[PDB]
Amino acid sequence: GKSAVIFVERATPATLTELKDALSNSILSVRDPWSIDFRTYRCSIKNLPADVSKLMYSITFHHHGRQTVLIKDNSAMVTTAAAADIPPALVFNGSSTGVPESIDTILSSKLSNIWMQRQLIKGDAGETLILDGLTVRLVNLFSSTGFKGLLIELQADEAGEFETKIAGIEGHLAEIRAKEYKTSSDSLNEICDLAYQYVRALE
């Protein structure tokens, strides 16, 4: 699998649709809407060894497992708050209580002195557009301060032709007059790079 995240900094709630139509003649079908939470935590340790970030990102995918990936210093930790995702063996030997919660809840309620939530960007009612061997997800990101931008999630099973697929979408962005945007297809396990890409495109 492969992926890329495009974040349109300069944009408005409408930009989503404008790009949605530039694909009207490339679309095939539309699957269920998706959601996503993007959190930023700042470390409160004051002796922090030089060149160790003080920043940690938390990317929560909704029904991509209700999973949350933690990213810090180019490293990622995949977690889940879904009892249904618990490895059977951990439930059997008692390692798990069978009733997990979010790593973010733990961070804010048990480790809040060490980690403070700085920002919380949410993307609701996203759209899953299905093209030719390229799935394109679109969602408007909002902060506690109103609109924050447009986010494009590009997932493609086709390991081959991809660099072309990404360039194509960036083109339709030029058409809708969407200039000054950031694109990431970097890498560090799918869910991890995807999470990483959001970070690169938003940080």
Residues forming the site for other proteins (CB under 8 A): 12-13, 40, 42-48, 54, 56, 67, 70-81, 85-103, 105-106, 109-119, 124-125, 143-148, 188-189, 192-193, 203
Residue 48 phi/psi, 5-degree rounding, is -25, 115
Cα–Cα distance measured from residue 161 to residue 167, given in angstroms and rounded to the nearest whole number: 11
Least separation in angstroms between CB 63 and other proteins? 16
* Residue with Cβ nearer other proteins (60 or 183): 60
Least Å distance, CB 24 to other proteins, is: 19
Closest approach of Cβ 26 to other proteins, in Å? 22
Find the shortest distance in angstroms from Cβ 98 to other proteins.
6
- C-beta closer to other proteins: residue 9 or 170: 9
How does DSSP assign the chain, residue by residue?
A: -EEEEEEESS--TTHHHHHHHTTTTT--EEE---EEEEEEEEE--SS--SSS-SEEEEEEEETTTSEEEEEETTEEEEEE--GGGS-HHHHHTTSS-S----HHHHHHHHSTTTEEEEEEEEE-S-EEEE-SS-EEEEEEEEEBTEEEEEEEEEEES-SSS-HHHHHHHHHHHHHTT--S-EEE-----HHHHHHHHHHHHH-
User: Between residues 27 and 86, which has the closer beta carbon with respect to other proteins?
Assistant: 86
- CB closer to other proteins, 97 vs 133: 97
Q: In the complex with other proteins, which residue's Cβ is closer, 112 or 167? A: 112
**Cβ at position 94, least distance to other proteins in Å:** 6
